[PDB]
Symmetry: D2
Subunit: 512 residues, 4 copies
């Protein structure tokens, strides 16, 4: 059998594991959406085309680097690459665009390299004149209060926490420190101050500018950096302004406080990013996996998208093949229950961006087939409280029906994505094919595992009921074309009693 | 809270038990249908009316007693009592009629100048069992006549003969030319025409005698809804019932009564071929050791639950009530446990056929079943059923389970289903929703037969079809709601799950909708 | 296979039910202890001997009736019957003796000219209930007198009044200047001095009257083992029993009978303070609606199972047998379901106290309990208990669960425990092993009280201590094995789990060993 | 609370996940043993001392490289480093030594292979040590070179270019490699292992039961004691796994080769399947290769590496390995310290509730008194949050049977057999203590002194504190195979 079905029929998790079969070919669209960071390696229209073809679903713009003009070019190229496939509506793949916020970063000064000798004296300055006078015994940083916040005996991580510094006297013109971990240091590198309370705002003048930019260029999603408390996302919301309620806000969890106040942060956000990079510097590297698995679990419970991020395939920045740990990282993110998996170096600057995307694609398909739905579904139902919202009620119904007949797909009409979401919330195995007129909602829905958006272009029919049927039919055809559904398959169709959003309430079983 | 909801939310069966609350009032129509046997105590139109009011859903005609004329009067009186409530379609309660077959019984003769007189079989004495036609009526303390010619040829020396609900006990010591010389092993007081059981003897009597066949044809002609088939031992037995029922009667549901060891052993083959099962505890309780019935009962109920077929629990559920206005503590727990076991219907016999409290007896099964229905640990039950039931490609099943699931998620007060033959109402109840299954149908018969399936409340719909089919569909669903409101099944603010189909005719159910009342 | 093993190996409760097998013979001592009530039917030494042979483990003396002298004779006769088997220590069966308290009973008066004669209260007729001192003797078909002046003040117009076991039903339709003008709801033949109940109406008689205290002091002096304490409504009720029991009687296990609504509601507090519980169905079934008892029964048994305390199921489990040599189908299933519920003991009252078949009645509870015990789905049962029971630091508990676990893994025939006060035997049964708990003790009393715990089979050990303690330990273990072999609990080639301790005196169990027989 | 106890008390796996707490400090010896490969970075006695201190439990000698003399020096150095702590029997840490077999490898001879260009096999000329290559790769066959980084399609054509070094691993999937599992050299290497008293054989390229039979034959009679760990490195091996496991003492998920022989996407499936099956069989299973590669070069692991380790433990692995990280890299001790740190966190996060349930449930009934005592002991341990289960064991088997059920309390195994003490590291949760005193006259006393020994060693290393409960497992008579007693004692 295929799809790891013998494994799906197991009575225990152990028996399940014991039955995973390397010769059981996956046989389903991959449900985990891939987010790819745009950079020099992935910015040319022709490259983007390849990346789309290979599996990219979300383009991530990292506003930690590049000017407004630079990101506008990125948006313009993505949109071009994406619309090059509009020749065939039945095959067209929407691509989301996520603005990633700079946030309260700290960076060293200005392709040369100094060497911080272990045990040696290094001075950290925020004096404007030393802004480029950086050397083996002097590092300049762009956070003037550094001197006010890192006390004697405090730690200062530099460059992915690879360099490490102990403050051994805080004198007038800077921090007198001793290198604890040396390393070959380069230009403008990221700095971390664990244990220190960085009074740096979650939203600086630039972030606000950057957000307004996102509104004007119609970005779909904000990955909000360094989110430490509910008011942080409120601030993002305010900045996003009224022209931008539609925009999904994904809070990146990058530090201890963020981890601790996670519950409050989730309730107020549209989803979460396990921001492992910073997280892995702010808390001990041994402990990330706990935060990751805790947050993914909690999101699964709340029904919100969760993203797993950073170094999932690092070696690929430089090599055509991933390390054995990277492969298992991707699979375990999926098995953890992550809605999306990300790429950074691997697609922004590396020598194999398309190969990197093909790999997340390949692994996610295997891992998705290896999900023990039986336990998963049971636990979700069991944990999720009762509900009175007809849309939820239909969803779980639909998912249940899908399971009973091994439906190829659940086809949903949706206006804002919400009813597609409520379906994927319960993790059907059948694919959730979402038919929508809202180009934006079609993009934002990539954030939810197992949704395949289809953008519908025809003008409304006179008779609403007809309009509904043409759309469902549209789903089926697109379905047939991309090999999601074959003649003789059963499909579950979810619709509503009247137009407008918020009235989903019907579930139907149809045969193809 | 009500409906034993704290108990419903328990994480284990033990925790569930630990949270059952005597002050949590049930709050739902009772889902276990009650079958009542018709006799002198329950035959008058006015009595029937009371029994309907009290909860009766199936009238059982016991063809072991009475003539054709006698049962025709019963049917006529039921139907009258039933139709007396047709003045209000929104409140009308359909009542099924079940013909219960005589089958291969054996009874003693009539007593010497005494149909209502008693002889006494003393422990340790010689009793001759005769088949001699001349002794039918001549029977005494040392002589009992029996209506089974072959008895003399089937009980060996050392073989046991039970008389009267197994309370009398004879052991064959000598066989002879003019009967069985027996010694009374258990004595007691004996009357006329009492049931005989022959465990250990293979009884070569047919499952369907010339009379049964006549009885069955009778059932066809008078439009009975259900056949409780006695002494069903193997698949061919129900085939025989089917043939006899003839072509004028495919619609009739066949319920095999399981009354003996062989029947218990070939149960699987019998179920596959029957519409449902009756755990016939009376005979079963004599054919196998009394200690073992509970095992057959729980096994069969379990298996039916699995197959999704109606199962009936029967006999002595409330015996003391034949004679007393209150049940014994075992009787009460018997009913509750039949329900908790997972029985679709519970029966009454003596209690409604001859006893002094037939209505009180019906009211009691009503009261207990409501409590017990609320105490079912659906969480486990539902999980196990899904888990056990094979995948399915039939859109009707698919919608059913969907509907049940949706119902659970919002504590739906009801699932309302349009159904033509009952099948989609049945597939719902197969998954044991807690929300009541309100089945709307134009088939008066299907409305009656549906009582066989736990949790289905049938509503007979009387209006002529609208021109636009979609409108006809809506009026029906609306009809369900209103009836619902009126009988306190649904209150304003409830959510309800509506199940319908894409086109007319049966077999095409495939839609599930969430509506608020 | 035997012992319903296929059914034990099932992955779900449903599959379990589906695999119960009527041909799978039980093969194990029955673990549910049987309490028999002593009366005219069961007071003769020779009868008692039969009842012991048949399975009785606890004699229950019902102090609601009979004088001190009368109960002394009962004790004497039991002890005589019991010690008649002392000729063989390997086979000797200890029998507990439980004193059942009268408590705050409410009663009717003596009849017009008839300490034996009878009045009929006809359904629908006017009935005056006086509290008038004069009429305590002047009762007829329209006048019943009652020994509780306050009844007039507590039952409001429209309230019920149940009489004699709840078989007679009166409704107050007028409160008058000397009596409640009642209509007869339920009719029937009324006797002299019968029990009256007042549901919903709150009562104010003490839990412990001057007589109870006397009765308790009596129990001490005659060395009763167990007090079944009637009408326990709150923790202080058992404190009172404890005080009355006096210092000569800490050893005595106190079982609170739960007989009313308040008792049901304050159950948690009552359990914490008692050694065990009695589900007193009789009264309970009159105080709260008859439909609801099964809920109180299953909730209490569940909670006791959780707490690890003995729970008894009681009253009417086999009533028809008071009068008939076979039980009704409901009675059989009642017993099975008590066991499946998880009851430690099952009781008999009328069936053994007055009826015509006391020994047969005891043989039946024995026969059913064995079947039902084999049908427990231990897999779930064990899982749930572990899961629910909090961590523990007491080495005795820790050894128990370990022992139970080891037993399961090798289908041990038995767990053999040395115990001084019964406590380590109890902690084993607490986890419901399937293997039998063979408890070896020198305390004749502890040997009796242990019957209160499902699955414990006490063996009284008589030899004087050896010089070397270790040797004394081994002879006792060996004693268990031999007794074991002799009664067919263990066969050559069986594995057995032996639980002992590091030093003498109670409270130090901490060793578990696997041995082969 | 500590040890992720709130998460242990969860009613579902989801709820469990939801309750993992980064501020819940682990508080227990780490139970996953660490296998470290010896090389230039890790061969000096002083280095070895550091690596023992940091957590190493098994030294891995990779016979794919180095001469006999070279491996003798390694053994010698390990043994020295190890015995330098013998100053104190209560603290002494035994270190196993595992001989890792070369087996049917293929390597290149002693340059950048351009994408597109011609390359013959016997810059435009790679040499290979497997003469039959010409015989088993047909027109349109694939030849991987160096950790599957290069790809050659058959005369070949380069499909994937790359920078080629000296003597590098060649892989041929789809081809049936008729090279023997045991060459003349392997046999020599194995005989070597016997003579120098290695403890464990990691047997390379195990494809079928007869492969381990061959290893067994070569190991000879002087070496029945030696535990044999079959390395699963290819498709056939994955397919015939059941047969292989039944006949082996344990398994190594040899990800490196496996990741080249089967698609990289699929390894995690083989890994989780094998670890699951081993957990079921009660045999040790090893997770291997690249668990921390970046550390070969960098002082900190990547985020994928960290999660790789934790997931191996959560998968249920008995041991985790390091190769380049400790054999040649610039951070061997840091690498060992990391596997130590992660394994402790991951171990505390195991959802025993489910795990234990499932193992009981799955494991068939048993009549062997040792098993019966084990499960009993584990059950007792759970009920009182025992700090430890202390077992007397002669061959390790009763320690093994305990760990088979994954207690959370640590399994402190007391033994006289120095070797058994070493091999027991293969079983999660076993902490061996070597006992040196001569037997007492009264056997019962000898038993007690040993149990007492375990307690004291326990106290000293902070496994058990006064007031803890401990579970003690012993037997009714001397000699192995008769464990049958379980006792609850307070410290
Ligand atoms: K950023
Ligand atoms: K009949
Ligand atoms: K009493
Ligand atoms: K090797
Ligand atoms: Mn970051
Ligand atoms: Mn019958
Ligand atoms: Mn009472
Ligand atoms: Mn390898």
């Amino acid at each position: 059998q295929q799809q790891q079905l013998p494994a799906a029929m197991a009575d225990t998790f152990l028996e399940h594991l014991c039955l995973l079969d390397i010769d059981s070919e996956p046989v389903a669209a991959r449900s985990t959406s891939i987010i790819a960071t745009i950079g020099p390696a992935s910015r040319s229209v022709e490259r983007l085309k390849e990346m789309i073809k290979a599996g990219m679903n979300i383009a991530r713009l990292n506003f930690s680097h590049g000017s407004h003009e630079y990101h506008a070019e990125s948006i313009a190229n993505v949109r071009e690459a994406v619309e090059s496939f509009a020749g065939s509506p039945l095959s067209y793949r929407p691509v989301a665009i996520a603005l990633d916020t700079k946030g309260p970063e700290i960076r060293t000064g200005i392709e040369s390299e100094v060497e911080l000798v272990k045990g040696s004296q290094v001075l950290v300055t925020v004096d404007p004149a030393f802004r480029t006078r950086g050397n083996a015994n002097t590092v300049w940083v762009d956070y003037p209060n550094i001197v006010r916040v890192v006390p004697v005996g405090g730690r200062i991580y530099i460059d992915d926490g690879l360099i490490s510094l102990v403050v051994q006297k805080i004198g007038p013109e800077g921090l007198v420190t001793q290198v604890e971990n040396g390393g070959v240091l380069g230009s403008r590198k990221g700095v971390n101050l664990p244990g220190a309370q960085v009074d740096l705002p979650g939203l600086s003048e630039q972030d606000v500018r950057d957000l307004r930019f996102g509104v004007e260029h119609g970005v779909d999603i904000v990955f909000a950096s360094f989110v430490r408390k509910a008011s942080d996302v409120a601030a993002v919301r305010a900045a996003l302004g009224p022209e931008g309620h539609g925009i999904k806000i994904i809070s990146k969890i990058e530090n201890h406080e963020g981890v601790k106040r996670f519950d409050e942060i989730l309730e107020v956000s549209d989803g979460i990013m396990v921001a492992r990079g910073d997280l892995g510097i702010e808390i001990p590297a041994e402990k990330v996996f706990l935060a990751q698995k805790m947050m993914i679990g909690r999101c699964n419970l709340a029904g919100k998208p969760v993203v797993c991020a950073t170094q999932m395939l690092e070696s690929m920045i430089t090599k055509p093949r991933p390390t054995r740990a990277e492969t298992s990282d991707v699979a375990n993110a999926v098995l953890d229950g992550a809605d999306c998996i990300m790429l950074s170096g691997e697609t922004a600057k590396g020598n194999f961006p398309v190969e990197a995307v093909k790999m997340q694609h390949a692994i996610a398909r295997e891992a998705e087939a290896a999900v023990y739905h039986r336990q998963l579904f049971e636990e979700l139902r069991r944990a999720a409280p009762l509900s009175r919202d007809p849309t939820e009620v239909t969803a779980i119904g639909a998912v249940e029906a899908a399971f009973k007949c091994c439906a190829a797909a659940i086809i949903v009409l949706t206006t804002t994505g919400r009813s597609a979401q409520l379906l994927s919330r319960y993790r059907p195995r059948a694919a959730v094919i979402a038919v929508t007129r809202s180009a934006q909602a079609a993009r934002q829905v990539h954030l939810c595992r197992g949704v395949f958006p289809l953008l519908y272009r025809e003008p409304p029919e006179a008779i609403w009921a007809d309009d509904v049927d043409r759309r469902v039919q549209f789903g089926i055809e697109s379905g047939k074309l991309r090999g999601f559904l074959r003649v003789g398959d059963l499909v579950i169709v979810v619709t509503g009693w009247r137009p407008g959003s918020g009235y989903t309430n019907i579930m139907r079983v149809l045969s193809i």
